[PDB]
Design a binder for these strands. Sequence first.
RNA 1: GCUCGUGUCGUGAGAUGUUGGGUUAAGUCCCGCAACGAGCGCAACCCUUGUUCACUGUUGCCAGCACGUUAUGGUGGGGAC
Length: 233
Amino acid sequence: MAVVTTRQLLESGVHFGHQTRRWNPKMKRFIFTERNGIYIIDLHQSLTYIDKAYAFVKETVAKGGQILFVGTKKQAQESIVEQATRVGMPYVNQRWLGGMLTNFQTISKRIARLKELEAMDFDKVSGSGLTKKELLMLSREKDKLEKDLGGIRDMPKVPQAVWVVDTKKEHLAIDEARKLKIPVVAILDTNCDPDEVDYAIPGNDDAIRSVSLLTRIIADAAAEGLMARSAGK
RNA sequence: GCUCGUGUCGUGAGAUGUUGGGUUAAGUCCCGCAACGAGCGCAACCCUUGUUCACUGUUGCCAGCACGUUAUGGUGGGGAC
């Protein structure tokens, strides 16, 4: 969308990148100016790329829409979850584990187990008595499953697209996504790869708000598409 | 301790899980983790021993009561031990 063009980007500081020490060579075209070691995003083609990502997410929600918001960095832990819960869009925030996208059967088994336990554990703790170190360990297992699984509850089948923040940390997600052929949209700074991302959105990924405004705008896009789905049906 | 399902890595045998840090009598748990799970083992359920309560009182027991061959709770009786 408009997102007041480059004004919001410049005020927030998206133009920041990484220094010369580590760099992905596929960024040769993507160079504005060498300012104080930190690489500078031109932020001009960024508008076009975010517009293209917006168009693709509109098309995905037109065909029905299922975006998996994957995130692990401390700069996005407290940002991804709130917007994903607001839009009602599936998300993972703590320890994206090997599988899920490929271990569909096991993850669905754990989804069913979590669904049944979230009721039976509460019924047992609130009703009939139970001894210690058994109810306690079941509650602890519930807590661990809740910590390691958030918005993954609601998915009937394989998703439609995945939104990635800090692909360097969440590398395995893109490998699974490319193996199973799902659209990928990711935040990439000057050290990431365009070959493994179809709809690439360059920009900083080291600040809390730097990923927060992008996740907020894509959440607004998802909410608008979900509203339009009422007429689309 | 030994393995499996699925995933993943490798052309392949195979690997990962099951490595690492901490802990435990224990692959016992915890933390992190391309692993996510499960199974047989460990543990627990069983028997016995250590404390205690209720119930029952003979062929067991005898605190309070009455005699007993002198004598043996032998006796009527007693639920205390």
